Amino acid sequence: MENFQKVEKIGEGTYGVVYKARNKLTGEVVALKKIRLTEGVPSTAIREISLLKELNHPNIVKLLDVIHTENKLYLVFEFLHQDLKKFMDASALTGIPLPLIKSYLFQLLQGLAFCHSHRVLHRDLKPQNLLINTEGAIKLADFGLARAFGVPVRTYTHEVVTLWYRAPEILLGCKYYSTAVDIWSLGCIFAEMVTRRALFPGDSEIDQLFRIFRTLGTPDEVVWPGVTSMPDYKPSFPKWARQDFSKVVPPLDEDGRSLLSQMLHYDPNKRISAKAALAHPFFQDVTKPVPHLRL
Ligand SMILES: CCC(C)(C)[C@H]1CCc2n[nH]c(C(=O)NC)c2C1
């Protein structure tokens, strides 16, 4: 772009670099993602992304514009001041207060209920693409399209993609993702906010898969019909017994643990939907606290 002045690099996104930029004309502060395209223009991929501009909801970071020019694809996002990853790190000694964790989870599920009702999947939810503001809101950002740009083994910067929040069906090679993959990721995020430690910190696809198995038990046809016929399932997978759930997220009350267990069901069909999750008793006393943010 030429109508933008970089303020600082927000990071090396999954497709390109992201800068905090000022719209030299409007004075608007935005998050600008630059995706390098090499020759064959991704018309399909480009149209999918563009439709995301109509996806407007209080818990979704607004995609202001999508500019394809000079073999580059620019995504202009509304700017929020901090991501959940940084907030979680900054809250590591004291932990995020439960009422705030609950508020964040509730809002994220409202956001997912919204995109899912519009047939939009995120596919790569993680603390890094969950953005928060001073008023207590948290918003989903950077919806992916495995249906197009697939899933680059490594972001444009040769950087390692995090597998910690990946649903088991994706790891087992399912060709078709369902909205259930986002519920799984959010469940993992919820656990992390609660314990202050990643639930399944795998450093490889198989390690990711096995860490899940070690905690939730190796899945079989009883809990997950069809699992043994999945593309990457191997009858040789070690058979781990399911761990007592009270050991998984200790500080969490029973309502929180029951909701989490439902978000982490192996069978995508048994996994709770965002809509049903919003009705869970865990949210009976949900409120909207203000986070203490250091910007
Ligand atoms: C790949 C796009 C990512 C990096 C997730 C951006 C999505 C949109 C966005 N808006 N603000 C921020 C921000 O980080 N602020 C401090 C972001 C992050």
Task: Note the Cα 109 to chain centre separation in Å.
Answer: 11
Distance CA 35, CA 266 (A): 34
Distance CA 40, CA 29 (A): 32
- Residue 207, SS3? helix
Q: Is 11 in the pocket of ligand 1 (CB under 6 A)?
A: yes
Locate the ligand 1 atom nearest the alpha carbon of residue 80 and give its number: 11
- Residue 27 shares a structural domain with residue 138: no
Angle at 276 between CA 274 and CA 279, to 5 degrees: 110
Positive or negative torsion for Cα 268, 274, 275, 276? positive
Confirm if 169 and 177 have CB atoms less than 8 A apart. yes
- Residue 52 shares a structural domain with residue 91: no
CA of 33 to the centre of ligand 1 (A): 8
- Residue 46 shares a structural domain with residue 125: no
- Residue 41 shares a structural domain with residue 126: no
Last residue of a domain, one of 20, 52, 81: 81
Last residue of a domain, one of 57, 81, 105: 81
10 Å CB burial of residue 266 (0-12, 13-18, 19+) is: buried
| Shortest-distance Cα residue to atom 8 of ligand 1 | 77
Question: Per-residue b/e over 142-158, b at no fewer than 16 CB within 10 Å?
Answer: bbbbeeebeeeeebeee
Confirm if 271 and 262 have CB atoms less than 8 A apart. yes
Domain count of the fold of the chain: 2
Last residue of a domain, one of 40, 57, 81: 81
- Residue 98 shares a structural domain with residue 69: no
Tell me which amino acid residue 142 is. Answer: D
Locate the ligand 1 atom nearest the alpha carbon of residue 10 and give its number: 14
Q: Is 80 in the pocket of ligand 1 (CB under 6 A)?
A: yes
Angle at 109 between CA 172 and CA 35, to 5 degrees: 65
Question: Per-residue b/e over 49-85, b at no fewer than 16 CB within 10 Å?
Answer: beebeebebebbbbbbebebeeeebbbbbbbbebbbb
Instruction: Give residue 271's domain range.
Output: 82-292
Q: What is the CA radius of gyration of the chain?
A: 19
Distance CA 218, CA 266 (A): 10
Q: What is the CATH number of the domain that holds 188?
A: 1.10.510.10
- Residue 1 shares a structural domain with residue 68: yes
Beta bridge partners of 69: 72
Q: What is the CATH number of the domain that holds 58?
A: 3.30.200.20
- Residue 257 shares a structural domain with residue 184: yes
**What angle, rounded to 10 degrees, do the helices at 254-263 and 180-195 form?**
140
10 Å CB burial of residue 5 (0-12, 13-18, 19+) is: exposed
Residue keyed to tokens 């933008």: 4
Note the resolution in Å, 1 decimal.
2.0
Query: What are the DSSP calls for 1-61, one per residue?
Result: --SEEEEEEEEE-SSEEEEEEEETTT--EEEEEEEE---S--HHHHHHHHHGGG---TTB-
Q: What are phi and psi of 259, to 5 degrees?
A: -60, -45
78 in a known ligand binding site: yes
How many residues make up the chain in this entry?
A: 295
CA of 31 to the centre of ligand 1 (A): 6
- Residue 140 shares a structural domain with residue 150: yes
Q: Is 30 in the pocket of ligand 1 (CB under 6 A)?
A: no
> Does residue 124 have an active-site annotation?
yes
Of 65, 89, 124, 285, catalytic: 124
| Shortest-distance Cα residue to atom 4 of ligand 1 | 13
Distance CA 140, CA 55 (A): 11
- 144: CB partners within 8 A, 6+ apart: 14, 122, 123, 124, 151
Confirm if 47 and 34 have CB atoms less than 8 A apart. no
Tell me which amino acid residue 7 is. Answer: V
DSSP label at residue 200: S
- Residue 152 shares a structural domain with residue 271: yes
- Residue 255 shares a structural domain with residue 160: yes
Locate the ligand 1 atom nearest the alpha carbon of residue 83 and give its number: 14
- Residue 45 shares a structural domain with residue 107: no
Distance CA 231, CA 168 (A): 12
Rounded (to 5) percent helix, strand, coil in the chain = 35, 15, 50
Q: Is 83 in the pocket of ligand 1 (CB under 6 A)?
A: yes
Distance CA 252, CA 190 (A): 10
83 in a known ligand binding site: yes
- Residue 142 shares a structural domain with residue 28: no
